[PDB]
Amino acid sequence: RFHSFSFYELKNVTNNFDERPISVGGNKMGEGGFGVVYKGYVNNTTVAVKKLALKQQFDQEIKVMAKCQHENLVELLGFSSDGDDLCLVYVYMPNGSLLDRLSCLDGTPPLSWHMRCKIAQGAANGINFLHENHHIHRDIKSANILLDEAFTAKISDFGLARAVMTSRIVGTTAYMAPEALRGEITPKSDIYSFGVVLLEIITGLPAVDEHREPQLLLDIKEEIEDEEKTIEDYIDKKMNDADSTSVEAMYSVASQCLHEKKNKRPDIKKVQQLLQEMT
């Protein structure tokens, strides 16, 4: 199904796991809580190699990736398990994550409103495919939305995905639904998290900022509803092509996604429908 790489092959293609960043001539692209991401080159093809630093998340990623293949899901090419180290090889996303592009990391120009609308639609198509295949992502966030050579949105990181209550609460607190913080596992929690992503797209602001008032982005929904502020006051100033009608239409979707009561949230098919009507 996927290519079985030996640890020595991934060792050489990543220039002996060169921990220096890409900008300084190394191979390190970044790091997460479960491992370091390296740029690799296998037979004239660029790859992303995640060296895990745990086995259940390796197995779950492979299991979900074998079952779910879609235009808006990142593709797994292979893996390595022969050593004491576990590696996952993916299709390389030249435009990194949506979080990095919204923050203009490493001098990248701001995303236009037109590109932002296409990204939101693509991400919704990806979540829709996961839910149609009875999978809950559990960690929907802008850092988990990757961008290819045409800025096509690709949902990533299926290590926490589930095919209901849990004793092990996992995810990113700033994006998590109230019931998800309580231990509930439901596809409606993915909808809430997508609502936070839509707010990041409109504002260009991260979900959480400790040196900001309010610290959490989902709290701007309260300020707008209580008439303290408007969505117009929060529109990313780094755009020149945003129109009030489509911004209000995306905000309306985000607002519906961010309902505290999980049953009042729209399903992903409705979210997909509202985002298509927006354009």
Ligand SMILES: CN(C)[C@H]1CC[C@H](Nc2ncnc3[nH]cc(C4CCOCC4)c23)CC1
């Ligand atoms: C913090 N920031 C600079 C970045 C950290 C690296 C990250 N990863 C990717 N970048 C490019 N192509 C990729 N294909 C697959 C991946 C993911 C898939 C899930 O596991 C982790 C790697 C990937 C992009 C954002």
